[PDB]
């Protein structure tokens, strides 16, 4: 997702909610301590979050249930 995000915007649907959930995933990647689902190959967390977006593994409700599972694990 370094040169092209058109596959991401056609699998998500729009730009703004895509970049909002991508920034939410990157904020959960930077200080949240989560492991990336995409290999790094000497890249920062932003294009890693975009590659997780364009792989179909990160969405709005997917990140919602992903943070809900962590909240239920922490509050147990």
Q: Which is nearer to other proteins, 5 or 69 (CB)?
A: 5
The distance of closest approach from Cβ of residue 11 to other proteins in the complex, given in angstroms and rounded to an integer, is 13
Question: How far, in Å, CA of 64 to CA of 30, rounded?
Answer: 18
Which residue lies nearer to other proteins by CB, 2 or 73? 2
Applying CB under 8 A, the residues found at the interface with other proteins are 1-5, 8-9, 15, 18-19, 22-23, 26-27, 30, 42-47, 49-50
Comparing CA positions, the residue from 55, 61, 69, 56 lying closest to residue 24 is 61
Report the 10 Å Cβ neighbour count for 74. 7
């Amino acid at each position: 997702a370094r040169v092209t995000v058109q596959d991401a915007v056609e699998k998500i649907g729009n730009r703004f909610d895509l970049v909002l959930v991508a920034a939410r995933r990157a904020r959960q990647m930077q200080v949240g301590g989560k492991d990336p689902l995409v290999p790094e190959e000497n890249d920062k967390t932003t294009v890693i979050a975009l590659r997780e977006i364009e792989e179909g593994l990160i969405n709005n409700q997917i990140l919602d249930v992903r943070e809900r599972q962590e909240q239920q694990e922490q509050e147990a």
